[PDB]
Paper text:
An essential histidine residue (H133/H143 in Sa-DHQ1 and St-DHQ1, respectively), is also involved in the formation/hydrolysis of the Schiff base intermediates.
Herein we report the synthesis of compounds 6–7 in which enhancement of the electrophilicity of an endocyclic carbon atom in the ligand towards covalent modification is attempted by direct introduction of the amino functionality into the quinate scaffold. These compounds are substrate analogs in which the carbonyl group at C3 has been replaced by a hydroxyamino and an amino group with R configuration (compounds 6 and 7, respectively). Compound 6 was found to be a time-dependent irreversible inhibitor of the two enzymes with K I values of 90 ± 8 and 130 ± 12 µM and k inact values of 8 ± 1 and 13 ± 1 ms−1 against Sa-DHQ1 and St-DHQ1, respectively. The two adducts Sa-DHQ1/6 and St-DHQ1/6 crystallized as dimers with two molecules in the asymmetric unit (namely chains A and B) and were solved at a resolution of 1.65 and 1.90 Å, respectively. Unbiased, calculated electron-density maps showed clear electron density for the ligand covalently bonded to the catalytic lysine residue (K160/K170 in Sa-DHQ1 and St-DHQ1, respectively) via an amine, which is visible in the two chains. Remarkably, among all the lysine residues present in the two enzymes (13 for Sa-DHQ1 and 11 for St-DHQ1), only the catalytic lysine residue is modified by the ligand. Surprisingly, no electron density for the tertiary hydroxyl group in position C1 was identified in the two enzyme adducts. Dehydration involving the C1–C2 bond took place to give a shikimate-like core, perhaps after covalent linkage at the C3 position in 6 via a similar mechanism to that observed for the natural substrate. Importantly, no cleavage of the amine bond promoted by the ligand was observed. Thus, compound 6 provides non-labile enzyme adducts by avoiding the intrinsic Schiff base hydrolysis performed by the enzyme. Finally, the active site of both adducts is closed by the substrate-covering loop, thus protecting the catalytic pocket from the water environment.
Author numbering:
A (entry chain AAA), B (entry chain AAA): 3 to 238
The structure:
Amino acid sequence: HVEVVATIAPQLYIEETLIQKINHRIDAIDVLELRIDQIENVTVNQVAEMITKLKVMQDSFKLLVTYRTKLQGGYGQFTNDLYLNLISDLANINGIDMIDIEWQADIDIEKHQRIITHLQQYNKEVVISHHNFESTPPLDELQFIFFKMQKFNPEYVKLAVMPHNKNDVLNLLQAMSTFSDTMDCKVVGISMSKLGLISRTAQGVFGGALTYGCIGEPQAPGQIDVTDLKAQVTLY
Amino acid sequence: HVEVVATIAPQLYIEETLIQKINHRIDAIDVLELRIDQIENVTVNQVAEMITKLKVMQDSFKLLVTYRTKLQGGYGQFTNDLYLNLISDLANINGIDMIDIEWQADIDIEKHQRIITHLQQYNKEVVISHHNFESTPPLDELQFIFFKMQKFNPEYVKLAVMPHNKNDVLNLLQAMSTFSDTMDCKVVGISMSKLGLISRTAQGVFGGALTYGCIGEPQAPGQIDVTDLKAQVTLY
Ligand SMILES: *[C@H]1C=C(C(=O)O)C[C@@H](O)[C@@H]1O
Ligand SMILES: *[C@H]1C=C(C(=O)O)C[C@@H](O)[C@@H]1O
Ligand SMILES: [Cl-]
Ligand SMILES: [Cl-]
């Protein structure tokens, strides 16, 4: 039941060459993730334009739009206020199925619940996400983070962490697995880098709902092509 | 550094057709495991004859001979006395590189140390093995079993256990991983069945030294072809 996400990161012009590679991989892709943080001064209208090119394929996959802030390992240098206005305004593009919203311990909980409630009222599935690109907290802290993110009643919680050792990979898998056993909410757990690759291929074994791959070059530490990732998912 | 084992289980006649399939897979196979417990009243001289056919390939892989008792999930119904005489007598076949000897909590420790010391004096590498085909003990018990088997100073310790859930798979990986961090001894940890398949493909990720696959049909619960298993090992 694990769905394969293809992450793309184009500029305001989605190339015909990229549309072509998406189509060659159509049977591997359940979710197409349009990263937009790589577009300096991206607007909602530019996102709407790019989605017009993708929606022809809307029958073959769900569309997820993700603005990854620089603080959380992406390229987005929007202010928190401009970022949260972008997330809220993405509710109006009909073609979007899913929206990523970032979680960290210092957020305004009230504002986050307002935006999340708004996205869901506009029939958008919310992925609440947390990335640590430096380290992997101990097991009890990983479970704590999943627990705090699920309190917003999102469709998905996503935790991505950087292992320094084997135990860090096992702690991410164990946290995801325990969460998946106890909660209705869908869970996504990533151990990044080649060391954590087993979290991407065996995601379904440990109760996770999405696994992220690329079409060309790795879009995050440890990513492989979605054709190869679908083949991996199929093995487990 | 994880070595791929190809398990074969022939009758006194090793078929030319089997020798052919071994040769097609020569680049995937580091260790050829000749199971012999499927041969009722197998003798050391019959093993010696079969090894004559295999030793032409001795440059391309190590030869491991394994008598798996019925109590430990194999077909061998030799008495403990006849089984331990077979293990000791395998020391005299020059072509054998490795010998599997079974461990369980009720063994005569003195006799086991004598045989293990004899095999090693005859320049055989010892794999001390324990199989539980019904269940997976809790983490502290898994570590206990590895700890008791390593006290014999074997070349390898091998624990194969049957998971009932995700936590059982994670406990096998964690036990193997902790053992590999603290001991010089090589370690092999198998979670059997499709649920435990990640233990076979990601064995090297968690500090394990061997991973077992087949040439045709699965020879143990969860096994895949050694070509596909080598490809998996190569990914991690
Ligand atoms: C979340 C996680 C990713 C990953 O680790 O592969 C890729 C990124 O684009 C997603 O937003
Ligand atoms: C030990 C383990 C095996 C496995 O689980 O694949 C196969 C068996 O032949 C080995 O002795
Ligand atoms: Cl699809
Ligand atoms: Cl070889």
